[PDB]
Symmetry: C3
């Protein structure tokens, strides 16, 4: 899966090693191997969330098969909010997540697409 986290927290208020811990977390939550989890963190941005510029973060999660339903995204959201709130020292009102299903033909890897792997 592919995780992208935007935050207006400066890099020095984003705890060291967060991207690796987020790989582990997403493995457990999503039921995917940690060695196929991709994480991108973009700190120090100018953000408003819910109209407010206090510290906040935006998580996008894209994956094949597992982020397409309300009922399991509810579970995923619960777990990622627990992880991120404590990691970033943010309240639940300062984080939002978006979920994006992908298909095999959309993912380029080793010079081909996953359709053929």
């Amino acid at each position: 899966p592919f995780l992208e986290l935007d935050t207006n927290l400066p890099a020095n208020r984003v705890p060291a090693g967060l991207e690796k811990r987020l790989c582990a977390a997403a493995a457990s939550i999503l039921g995917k191997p940690a060695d196929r989890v991709n994480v991108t963190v973009r700190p120090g941005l100018a953000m408003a969330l819910s109209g407010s510029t206090e510290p906040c973060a935006q998580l996008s999660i894209s994956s094949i098969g597992v982020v397409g339903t309300a009922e399991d995204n509810r579970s995923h959201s619960a777990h990622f909010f627990e992880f991120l709130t404590k990691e970033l020292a943010l309240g639940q009102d300062r984080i939002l997540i978006r979920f994006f299903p992908l298909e095999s033909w959309q993912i380029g890897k080793i010079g081909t697409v996953m359709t053929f792997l």
Copy 2:
């Protein structure tokens, strides 16, 4: 709604308070409350737009219900171009927008999804 603005303008050529003004602007344009508008600005990037690396900006807008049609996106585009051209001191040839419909089951908030709120 969710706005993401990438620019190769350095942060010190992006006017202070732009993210809050963009919340207000997007409220009026999209017909959504300002306190549910999210803005992310990513300045100082390396960009080419239309093959050219002069100052430019890319706006992405994602929302439920209101960014799914050509006829209303035409109106939205008009208004956001007016706002951004003057805010960033960019010509209309240096900005592009992409619109992305979302569904309730895609948006994680307060540890659940909007399907259940």
Copy 3:
């Protein structure tokens, strides 16, 4: 088309002029004019790819008409991997691509949408 490249390579390990060369490359690969190619490079990010925080890059490609099939995305992936591996001095295991079809009503340009141009 719209290209977005995230990398944990610091800006000073991203070769000068990469965004313009990527315009040219994407023109040839995708069969689109270079003057309608948009490139955004976001360097110096915190990333893990495949669970690993070594140098890596993520490419997103969005376009009308040409990134919707497995068979042609396989070709596109091949060409972009060749370009990026050598440009960024990254191995094929350190790059991934995602492809996103767009429709005319999604693209805001010159204050309208492409549906009407």
